[PDB]
Amino acid sequence: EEPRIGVYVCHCGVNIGGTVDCPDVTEFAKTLKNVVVARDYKYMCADPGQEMIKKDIKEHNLNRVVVAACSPRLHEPTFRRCVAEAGLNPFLFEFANIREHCSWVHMHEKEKATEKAKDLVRMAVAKARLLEPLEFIKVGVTQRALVIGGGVAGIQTALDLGDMGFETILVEKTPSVGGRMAQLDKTFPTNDCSICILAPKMVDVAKHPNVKLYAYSEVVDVQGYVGNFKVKIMKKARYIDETKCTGCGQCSEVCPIDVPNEFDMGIGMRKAIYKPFPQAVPAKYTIDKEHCIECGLCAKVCGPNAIDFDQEPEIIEAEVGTIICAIGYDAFDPTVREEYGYGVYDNVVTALELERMINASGPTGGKVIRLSDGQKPKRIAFIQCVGSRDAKVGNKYCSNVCCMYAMKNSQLIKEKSPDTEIDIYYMDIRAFSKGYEEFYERSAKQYGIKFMRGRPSQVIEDPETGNLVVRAEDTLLGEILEKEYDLVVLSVGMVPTKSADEVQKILGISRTPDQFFMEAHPKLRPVDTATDGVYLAGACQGPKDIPASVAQGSAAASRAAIPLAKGEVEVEPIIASVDAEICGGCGVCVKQCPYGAPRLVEKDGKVVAEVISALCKGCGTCPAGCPSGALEQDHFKTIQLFKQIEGMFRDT
Amino acid sequence: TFPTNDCSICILAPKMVDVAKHPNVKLYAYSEVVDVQGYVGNFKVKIMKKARYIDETKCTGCGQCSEVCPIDVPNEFDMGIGMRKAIYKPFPQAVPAKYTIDKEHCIECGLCAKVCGPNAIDFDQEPEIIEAEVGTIICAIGYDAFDPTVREEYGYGVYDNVVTALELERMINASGPTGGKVIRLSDGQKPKRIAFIQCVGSRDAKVGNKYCSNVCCMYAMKNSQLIKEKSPDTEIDIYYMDIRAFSKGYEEFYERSAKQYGIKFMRGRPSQVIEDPETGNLVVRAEDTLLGEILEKEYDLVVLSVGMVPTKSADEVQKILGISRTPDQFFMEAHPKLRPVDTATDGVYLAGACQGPKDIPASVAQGSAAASRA
Amino acid sequence: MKYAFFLGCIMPNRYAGVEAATRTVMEKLGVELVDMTGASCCPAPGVFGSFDQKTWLTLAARNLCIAEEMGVDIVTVCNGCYGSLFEAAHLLHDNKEALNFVNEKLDKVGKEYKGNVKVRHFAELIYNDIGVDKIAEKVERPLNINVGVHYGCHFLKPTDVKHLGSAERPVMLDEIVEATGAKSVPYADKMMCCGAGGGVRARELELSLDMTNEKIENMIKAGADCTVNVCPFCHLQFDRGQIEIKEKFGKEYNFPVLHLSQLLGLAMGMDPKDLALSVHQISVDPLLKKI
Amino acid sequence: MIYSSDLNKNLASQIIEAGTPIPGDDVVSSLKACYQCGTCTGSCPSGRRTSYRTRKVIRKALLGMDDVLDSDDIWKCTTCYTCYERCPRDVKVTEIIKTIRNLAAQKGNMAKAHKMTAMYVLKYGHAVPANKNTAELRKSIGLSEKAPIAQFSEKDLNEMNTLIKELGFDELIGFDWEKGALKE
Amino acid sequence: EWEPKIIGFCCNWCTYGGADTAGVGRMQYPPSIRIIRVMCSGRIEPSLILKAFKEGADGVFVGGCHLGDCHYDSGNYKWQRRVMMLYELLEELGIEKERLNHEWISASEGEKFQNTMKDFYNKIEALGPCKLKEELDK
Amino acid sequence: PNPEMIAEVVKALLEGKEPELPKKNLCEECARKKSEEGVAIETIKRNYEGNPDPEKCLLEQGYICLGIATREGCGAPCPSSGVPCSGCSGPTDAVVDQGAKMISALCSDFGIDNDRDVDPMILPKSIKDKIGSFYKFTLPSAFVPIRL
Numbered sequence A: 001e002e003p004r005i006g007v008y009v010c011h012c013g014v015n016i017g018g019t020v021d022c023p024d025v026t027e028f029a030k031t032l033k034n035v036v037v038a039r040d041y042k043y044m045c046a047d048p049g050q051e052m053i054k055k056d057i058k059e060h061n062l063n064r065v066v067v068a069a070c071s072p073r074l075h076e077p078t079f080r081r082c083v084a085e086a087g088l089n090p091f092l093f094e095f096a097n098i099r100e101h102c103s104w105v106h107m108h109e110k111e112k113a114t115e116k117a118k119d120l121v122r123m124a125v126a127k128a129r130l131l132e133p134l135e136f137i138k139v140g141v142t143q144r145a146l147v148i149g150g151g152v153a154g155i156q157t158a159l160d161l162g163d164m165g166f167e168t169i170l171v172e173k174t175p176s177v178g179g180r181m182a183q184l185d186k187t188f189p190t191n192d193c194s195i196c197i198l199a200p201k202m203v204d205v206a207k208h209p210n211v212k213l214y215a216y217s218e219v220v221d222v223q224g225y226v227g228n229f230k231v232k233i234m235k236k237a238r239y240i241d242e243t244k245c246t247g248c249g250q251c252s253e254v255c256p257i258d259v260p261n262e263f264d265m266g267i268g269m270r271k272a273i274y275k276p277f278p279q280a281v282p283a284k285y286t287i288d289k290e291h292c293i294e295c296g297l298c299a300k301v302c303g304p305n306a307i308d309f310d311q312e313p314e315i316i317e318a319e320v321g322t323i324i325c326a327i328g329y330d331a332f333d334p335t336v337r338e339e340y341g342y343g344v345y346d347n348v349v350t351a352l353e354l355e356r357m358i359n360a361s362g363p364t365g366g367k368v369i370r371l372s373d374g375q376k377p378k379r380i381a382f383i384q385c386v387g388s389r390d391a392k393v394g395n396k397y398c399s400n401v402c403c404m405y406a407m408k409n410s411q412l413i414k415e416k417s418p419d420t421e422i423d424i425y426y427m428d429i430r431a432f433s434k435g436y437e438e439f440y441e442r443s444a445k446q447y448g449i450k451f452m453r454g455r456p457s458q459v460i461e462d463p464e465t466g467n468l469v470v471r472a473e474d475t476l477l478g479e480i481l482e483k484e485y486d487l488v489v490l491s492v493g494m495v496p497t498k499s500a501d502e503v504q505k506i507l508g509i510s511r512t513p514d515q516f517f518m519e520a521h522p523k524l525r526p527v528d529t530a531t532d533g534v535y536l537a538g539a540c541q542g543p544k545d546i547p548a549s550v551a552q553g554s555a556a557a558s559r560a561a562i563p564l565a566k567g568e569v570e571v572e573p574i575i576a577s578v579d580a581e582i583c584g585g586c587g588v589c590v591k592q593c594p595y596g597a598p599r600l601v602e603k604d605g606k607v608v609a610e611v612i613s614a615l616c617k618g619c620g621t622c623p624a625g626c627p628s629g630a631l632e633q634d635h636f637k638t639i640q641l642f643k644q645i646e647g648m649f650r651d652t
Numbered sequence B: 001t002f003p004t005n006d007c008s009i010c011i012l013a014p015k016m017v018d019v020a021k022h023p024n025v026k027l028y029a030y031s032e033v034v035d036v037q038g039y040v041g042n043f044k045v046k047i048m049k050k051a052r053y054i055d056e057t058k059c060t061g062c063g064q065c066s067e068v069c070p071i072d073v074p075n076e077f078d079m080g081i082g083m084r085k086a087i088y089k090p091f092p093q094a095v096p097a098k099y100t101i102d103k104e105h106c107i108e109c110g111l112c113a114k115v116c117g118p119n120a121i122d123f124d125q126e127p128e129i130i131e132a133e134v135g136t137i138i139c140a141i142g143y144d145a146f147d148p149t150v151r152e153e154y155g156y157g158v159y160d161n162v163v164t165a166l167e168l169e170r171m172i173n174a175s176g177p178t179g180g181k182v183i184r185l186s187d188g189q190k191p192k193r194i195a196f197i198q199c200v201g202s203r204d205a206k207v208g209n210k211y212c213s214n215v216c217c218m219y220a221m222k223n224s225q226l227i228k229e230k231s232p233d234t235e236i237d238i239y240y241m242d243i244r245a246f247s248k249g250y251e252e253f254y255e256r257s258a259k260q261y262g263i264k265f266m267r268g269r270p271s272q273v274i275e276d277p278e279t280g281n282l283v284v285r286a287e288d289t290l291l292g293e294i295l296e297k298e299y300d301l302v303v304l305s306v307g308m309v310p311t312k313s314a315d316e317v318q319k320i321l322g323i324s325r326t327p328d329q330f331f332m333e334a335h336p337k338l339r340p341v342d343t344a345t346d347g348v349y350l351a352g353a354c355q356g357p358k359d360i361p362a363s364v365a366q367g368s369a370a371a372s373r374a
Numbered sequence C: 001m002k003y004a005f006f007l008g009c010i011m012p013n014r015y016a017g018v019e020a021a022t023r024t025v026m027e028k029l030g031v032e033l034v035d036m037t038g039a040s041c042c043p044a045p046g047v048f049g050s051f052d053q054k055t056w057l058t059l060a061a062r063n064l065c066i067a068e069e070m071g072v073d074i075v076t077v078c079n080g081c082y083g084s085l086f087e088a089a090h091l092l093h094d095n096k097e098a099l100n101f102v103n104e105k106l107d108k109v110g111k112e113y114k115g116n117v118k119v120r121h122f123a124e125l126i127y128n129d130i131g132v133d134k135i136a137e138k139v140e141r142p143l144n145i146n147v148g149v150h151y152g153c154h155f156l157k158p159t160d161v162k163h164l165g166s167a168e169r170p171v172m173l174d175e176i177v178e179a180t181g182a183k184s185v186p187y188a189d190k191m192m193c194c195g196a197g198g199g200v201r202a203r204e205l206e207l208s209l210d211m212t213n214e215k216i217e218n219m220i221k222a223g224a225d226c227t228v229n230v231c232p233f234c235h236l237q238f239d240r241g242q243i244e245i246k247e248k249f250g251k252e253y254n255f256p257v258l259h260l261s262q263l264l265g266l267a268m269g270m271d272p273k274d275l276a277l278s279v280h281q282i283s284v285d286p287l288l289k290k291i
Numbered sequence D: 001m002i003y004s005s006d007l008n009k010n011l012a013s014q015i016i017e018a019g020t021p022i023p024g025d026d027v028v029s030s031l032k033a034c035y036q037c038g039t040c041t042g043s044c045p046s047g048r049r050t051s052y053r054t055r056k057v058i059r060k061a062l063l064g065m066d067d068v069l070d071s072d073d074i075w076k077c078t079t080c081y082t083c084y085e086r087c088p089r090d091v092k093v094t095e096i097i098k099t100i101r102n103l104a105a106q107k108g109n110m111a112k113a114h115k116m117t118a119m120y121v122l123k124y125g126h127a128v129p130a131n132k133n134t135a136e137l138r139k140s141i142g143l144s145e146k147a148p149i150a151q152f153s154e155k156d157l158n159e160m161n162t163l164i165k166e167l168g169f170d171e172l173i174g175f176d177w178e179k180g181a182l183k184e
Numbered sequence E: 001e002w003e004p005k006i007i008g009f010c011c012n013w014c015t016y017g018g019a020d021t022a023g024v025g026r027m028q029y030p031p032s033i034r035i036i037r038v039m040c041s042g043r044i045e046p047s048l049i050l051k052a053f054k055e056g057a058d059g060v061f062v063g064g065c066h067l068g069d070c071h072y073d074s075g076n077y078k079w080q081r082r083v084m085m086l087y088e089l090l091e092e093l094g095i096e097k098e099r100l101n102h103e104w105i106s107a108s109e110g111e112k113f114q115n116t117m118k119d120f121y122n123k124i125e126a127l128g129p130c131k132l133k134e135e136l137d138k
Numbered sequence F: 001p002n003p004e005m006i007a008e009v010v011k012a013l014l015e016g017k018e019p020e021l022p023k024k025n026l027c028e029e030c031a032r033k034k035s036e037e038g039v040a041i042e043t044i045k046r047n048y049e050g051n052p053d054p055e056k057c058l059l060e061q062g063y064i065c066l067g068i069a070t071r072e073g074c075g076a077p078c079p080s081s082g083v084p085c086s087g088c089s090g091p092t093d094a095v096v097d098q099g100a101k102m103i104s105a106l107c108s109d110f111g112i113d114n115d116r117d118v119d120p121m122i123l124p125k126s127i128k129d130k131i132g133s134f135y136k137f138t139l140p141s142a143f144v145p146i147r148l
């Protein structure tokens, strides 16, 4: 069939038209072979612009459509649906970018920008001629979800999916669910205990009939695609029989080895046989073989005889349709900002360490005390933006919660000890959500918390008393302050969790400049990823608070429930396929695919390569590496790309 | 839309198109819920399909009957800057694409009917009451921009060159009343110097709004970049207390506004705005708190970064659904952390700005969260 | 090791003993110091960088060309010259617009900078290329005294281009002075400025002396017997500045001042007469009695 | 009271143009990234004994206060680079101060001692030239009586003079070649 | 009187987005380049670059994700091995190595893309036109 | 061309039929055993280096064999005789530039078992005559058929 092309040059009001001479590009498009219709319009994506294409496809019997406008990353689906509504296959549509790639970057070179637009149109027309009609691959959806991370965000996703009636698997790396919320004493702006909201949810998710909780477990492998994922979960050995364990803790009172409690940020001491925190779920114990001396003293007091040192980790193979990543975050390590002396001075602590100190079930019994002498501080200084809004540490983002938790912990210290003097050293107070500004007003008006606008230059310790001096300019007075404190609290920012690299490779997802996980689109798909069937929820997607992490958990459940509810999903046909008549089975393609789609097989008594269509993601690496030309990626065939290259210099 | 500066309608329009032709979604535009009875899983709702007084099916959406209409109504879509007729279309990319007659300002002269070919115009059209049974309800009625007339020292409604940020959005918008040109309302000239005044109607006990409107720091910086892109010679100063660029790519957007676009920031909430009656230029009186000196800089246009308030119909919807409000006057969620999109009324949920001031991704995430919960 | 020895101004024309001390110390360490004939002022960034940046870089590149024509790299014992020539070389290598502007000016005098010159500070050269172990091997007279080490500012900063490690908690000079048998005593605000830099000594003398006085006080409180620097500018400020502090504020310390080269020379059995300690404004005799 | 008429709106851009291409457009344009945190002021050794506030100098530049070029404060910076090392917004503070001083010098705000220093380099090629006592000292120490520097090389002195005239540095400091001295 | 003809090959996930970012931020750069879109840089092979030079390209640019950040996990590692061989093959054919430029640019790196376009344009402008097409047309 | 192919083409034209050439690459006709896991190259050797195994694919052994980028029909007498294919029959109908495609394939499989860590400079450094290795019989038909 001979190509009948319709070329549409968008003006985008004046965004394109103001730099590129669109009428002249339209005249030039008409001189190209196979171009039957060429028109220029103010807004091609608008109703009149879309109806103009549909009417021409019918009235001029077009079999190809070229739109010279903005980016396919913005309107490729839009124009695909538009042409499909007129009966034209969506893979016979080609987009030429003359806005972001031309009019917006060559504003002072109008003549050259117009000639560039003509070449970009000729390149689009060149590829268009050889485009072919393609059909989407329909695949089934396994009615089961997987949630990675058992924090407030992950728990919310699993509870919502479970409540909807979908089988869900919740994998938690540590022995207990709850996450960082469990480490906090209170939570802003209601000043409720973190337990108030979290514990009931932890209890609910642990006994939910549609949620299978795998605590102290990790996802070690994920294979497949949307609706057809094959996952491997490694159930780490706790060395205790969970079904026989009571969780009384008679064992902990006999263990003679002391290990620093990771839950208390090293500020607390736990035993080899431990329970993360008193409200932990599952209420079971765990033996750390890295520090266990295997004396067997805990086994003598254990009544049900659950302790078993011969326990081996179990690999559980599970099939899921959608995956939700809710692995959270880690607190920034402030050792790098050496002027503040963290890791050098005993009385310089992080805010997460203060949470453990203030917490009633913490290592200090809920008492804020100096680590140098065990005394309670009379003067405390909070230093904001530690590890955030700072190019020197490579973190040029706002960690979102540090203004609010500093004010919250200050209110909590004032409640326990009103005589305490508290100063907060800040740049901007970010109390941006519901009841936050009011919480900020309350901190100053009711609790007498003081605010000093000035980012401290350095902290100096008195080696003799352990007291610290904060050097900072009070920018609102234009004077340098050198106030002394008994304790300095660094309001550390958020960073991706240490395991984020492992999870990224397993799920095949991307990261944004802040190093957190990349959402499909900031505005319209905040919990989806560009990888179909993989979603995000909580702090692992970016620094945010509990209300936002809970809402994201619910948002992810809804989005991950769409493919499950549908029971069938479509996959892009821009995949690789082997021409059996040309392939002599050289085997070069096999190892190039990271998903193992291309496979060697026997057909008609001889060896030939064959691609498992569902496994192809459409990168185009194996067809580029095929030495016989038998392997080709539909929509990015070598002949198609060759014509596109020719199109820059000449027609056809 | 910040922080990507993507065309708002160019990215929202596809979703408007999708929802209008979705096989499982029945769209009742130009309609209002007038009654809700029952309880969770057994709600009996009454929807009033308002009469456009134009035949829906025979309506082409060309717009030739408006030219003859003699009544000029201020266009709500253009925030009062523009003038529309009694017979109209909200915006060029509207979904569904059809015209409407506003009987609150219609004089029934019949001049539009003489020009109309299809004779779609029918004043005897009657609103239809649709009875529907639903199991769950999601309230997503949004918000309204704060009216800054109350803060009289700023002179909004008195001075011609004092505008709100939502009015500026329309002036900047290509499909707006000025054709995408930022111009002074006193003489139609482009302003060479612009001042943005933050927290107007927010973080203010005098107007009864002691909350942060959440999006004003970001939209002021965004619109300042859009003006610099259109006219780099323009001088732009932002009068603030705290720059709240708290989410992903926001702090970077703030850094970029200053470093790349040369947008200036003045830490100090202005005391008042004084107009020069001879030129229409405005003087902003404010203390530069970072210098401890009083500034009295002159500008060609003053933009008030107005906060968010509940929408005008919120009272009607509250009574119909039987839901509560929080101190900020927005709708009350069951719990700020245990249930951000649920209400204490079973089967009734919230989503978007009607629950509290927030940006697009937060509203979109709440929309998805409400779908899951409902 | 062969290096074009950049002298500067203060060392070769005022504190000449620092030159003599460097010449023998570097010879003992196996470094061939070749004369950089016709080398002028770096020029001093304090006045030239502050007066006209174009002039500072053009004149700095002119000096770099001298060493480039010799086909060898540069070495210096002055933080001011190090900072000036090093930042000039970096800027010419990283910025082509700056290189074009400077070469267009140097073409008038038949010169052209090609970017083959590396500027080195003798302290970091001794630390990274020779080794601190070689200092101890050449020690003839161990100097068992307490030293108030003054790194200066243009030695390690700016760290983004210098790449000599930490500027907040360095060990480089402390390990070099401790190799002579001395002890680097820790004092308050160890990394602070002497006050002489950026043309402050010449324009705001009292301001510069206030900062030097604080450094001297902190060193004396720490138990220091003397102060060591790697900058004839810091040297002048600490030495001549003590006379000014006595004439203006009335405070007398008589704190001996030494340039690392002179400290290494004493340690390597050099005759105090060849180090020109007599030309110092403050007597080094109390220190000579302790060693 | 500060009015629009007392401010020079292009001061920031003017400081950037004076820094292009030396020390660089990207280096001096960093003054626009300043978010007035005060870390530079708190780190300043000079600020601890004077009215000099590093942050206010950057503020005065961004706001357009003309007096910053006439002020004595910009000349109190010792160029210790501590603010440069600690700035969380990557502001090349020390380089911006030096570039502002260039505009100050063009306006005529140069100390006599700094100009005398600039004259010695133009006349003798050195900021601190050799005298009769230098020759005597170097002799007794065992060094060459006259160092191998530009001072004793007419070829190198004439090379510098050609560059200085081309750069316009002689006109900046106000040096008269015929009289062999500075004017004013 | 002459302007370089530069052809570009950019991956849809990172460099294509990086080029769009430069456009959204109105980051101006020379108009010599014409970009071709591929899904991954792994799609790029010697045949596409050599074909561009045959057609008259004065310079060829290729953009992909950062090493380790490929949307398709490792497509850019195969392209990296192919381009190193191609650089030396071009030199054997009398084509300056500098006429080929490959960079790793993300979707958020608009400023980097702008400077890469400026630097590559300046590099090719200085080299002058590639006389291959002229020699072949004789 | 083999004598039979010449007769087949001429005979088809005498009858009036359109002549048809074989379409696959040489590995089809080559009797050497291939790894089912796929092709993986550890090092690159020149034809005189080492002693080649007579059963295993020469490309997997580290020799530059053009068989993967060459049209079948010859009967693969070169690999059968103990030497790699030199690509004398030219490329298949789906490949324009044989050398470019051979280079693409070779680079892709070189160190594929250690893909992320293999040094991309070993291969270009190991081949001192690239044009002679990949364009022996097809340089004039290549995209860049001359040395400037």
Ligand SMILES: Cc1cc2nc3c(=O)[nH]c(=O)nc-3n(C[C@H](O)[C@H](O)[C@H](O)COP(=O)(O)OP(=O)(O)OC[C@H]3O[C@@H](n4cnc5c(N)ncnc54)[C@H](O)[C@@H]3O)c2cc1C
Pocket: A148, A149, A150, A151, A152, A153, A154, A171, A172, A173, A174, A176, A177, A178, A179, A180, A181, A184, A186, A187, A188, A189, A217, A218, A219, A326, A327, A328, A329, A330, A331, A351, A352, A355, A401, A404, A405, A408, A497, A499, A503, A537, A538, A539, A540, A544, A545, A546, A547, A549
């Ligand atoms: C000092 C401090 C105080 C704060 N105070 C408040 C406050 O008062 N109010 C408020 O709203 N917010 C506060 N925040 C923010 C709050 O902590 C977060 O909003 C919240 O914890 C985010 O929940 P999350 O589930 O997304 O992440 P997380 O709480 O970090 O949960 C992640 C979970 O995933 C698990 N996980 C990690 N890796 C893996 C893996 N590979 N496989 C399986 N599971 C894994 C983790 O063990 C963890 O249980 C504070 C933060 C800090 C640092």
Ligand SMILES: Cc1cc2nc3c(=O)[nH]c(=O)nc-3n(C[C@H](O)[C@H](O)[C@H](O)COP(=O)(O)OP(=O)(O)OC[C@H]3O[C@@H](n4cnc5c(N)ncnc54)[C@H](O)[C@@H]3O)c2cc1C
Pocket: B001, B002, B003, B031, B032, B033, B140, B141, B142, B143, B144, B145, B165, B166, B169, B215, B218, B219, B222, B311, B313, B314, B317, B351, B352, B353, B354, B358, B359, B360, B361, B363
């Ligand atoms: C000047 C300005 C600039 C901004 N810039 C940005 C930006 O750059 N980026 C960004 O992310 N956010 C920005 N925002 C915030 C953004 O506007 C909101 O996030 C967004 O509109 C929230 O959408 P919504 O659906 O919740 O409410 P809305 O957008 O207000 O929509 C509510 C809908 O409900 C309808 N409705 C109202 N009452 C009833 C009723 N009784 N019955 C039926 N329907 C009803 C309304 O007609 C309306 O269509 C800005 C806000 C302002 C004021």
Ligand code: SF4
Pocket: A010, A011, A012, A013, A015, A016, A042, A043, A044, A045, A046, A069, A070, A071, A075, A099, B007, B010
């Ligand atoms: S198609 Fe693209 S360029 Fe044209 S109006 Fe729409 S967004 Fe603007």
Ligand code: SF4
Pocket: A240, A244, A245, A246, A247, A248, A249, A250, A251, A252, A284, A285, A298, A301, A302, A303, A304, A306, A307
């Ligand atoms: S292991 Fe035994 S002793 Fe320890 S808590 Fe479990 S049941 Fe009690």
Ligand code: SF4
Pocket: A254, A255, A256, A257, A271, A272, A273, A287, A291, A292, A293, A294, A295, A296, A297, A298, A299
């Ligand atoms: S056997 Fe292990 S867990 Fe039990 S008491 Fe001994 S060290 Fe502790």
Ligand code: SF4
Pocket: A384, A385, A386, A388, A389, A397, A398, A399, A400, A401, A402, A403, A404, A428, A429, A430, A491, A493, B246
């Ligand atoms: S939330 Fe507050 S303390 Fe935290 S990074 Fe942002 S401004 Fe700094």
Ligand code: SF4
Pocket: A578, A582, A583, A584, A585, A586, A587, A588, A589, A590, A608, A609, A625, A626, A627, A628, A629, A630, A631, F025
């Ligand atoms: S690389 Fe090409 S010829 Fe070789 S097995 Fe794969 S499809 Fe067949």
Ligand code: SF4
Pocket: A575, A576, A592, A593, A594, A595, A596, A597, A598, A611, A615, A616, A617, A618, A619, A620, A621, A622, A623, A633, E072
């Ligand atoms: S084109 Fe990419 S994803 Fe598809 S089969 Fe080949 S290597 Fe695998």
Ligand code: SF4
Pocket: B054, B058, B059, B060, B061, B062, B063, B064, B065, B066, B099, B116, B117, B118, B119, B120, B121
């Ligand atoms: S009412 Fe009539 S004239 Fe107006 S848009 Fe509808 S069809 Fe057109």
Ligand code: SF4
Pocket: B068, B069, B070, B071, B085, B086, B087, B101, B102, B105, B106, B107, B108, B109, B110, B111, B112, B113
């Ligand atoms: S009848 Fe109503 S809508 Fe029509 S022209 Fe008259 S006033 Fe306008």
Ligand code: SF4
Pocket: A432, B198, B199, B200, B202, B203, B211, B212, B213, B214, B215, B216, B217, B218, B242, B243, B244, B305, B307
């Ligand atoms: S977001 Fe910014 S402008 Fe808006 S109320 Fe809060 S602080 Fe004020």
Ligand code: SF4
Pocket: D033, D034, D035, D036, D037, D038, D039, D040, D041, D054, D055, D058, D083, D086, D087, D088, D089, D090, D091, D093
């Ligand atoms: S440290 Fe940097 S951002 Fe902070 S005030 Fe000083 S120059 Fe500005």
Ligand code: SF4
Pocket: D040, D043, D044, D045, D046, D047, D054, D076, D077, D078, D079, D080, D081, D082, D083, D084, D093, D094, D097
């Ligand atoms: S460089 Fe200048 S302004 Fe900065 S800290 Fe040092 S003396 Fe102060």
Ligand code: SF4
Pocket: A586, F026, F027, F030, F031, F032, F034, F056, F057, F058, F059, F060, F065, F066, F067, F068, F076, F079, F084, F085
């Ligand atoms: S030796 Fe050559 S022709 Fe034979 S299988 Fe190996 S690559 Fe193919």
Ligand code: SF4
Pocket: F067, F070, F071, F074, F075, F076, F077, F078, F079, F084, F085, F086, F087, F088, F089, F090
């Ligand atoms: S070089 Fe020629 S004859 Fe030898 S195997 Fe290859 S194609 Fe056949």
Ligand SMILES: O=S(=O)(O)CCS
Pocket: C043, C044, C045, C046, C047, C079, C080, C081, C154, C196, C197, C198, C199, C231, C233, C234, D079
């Ligand atoms: O005054 S200068 O900064 O040039 C030298 C001090 S090291």
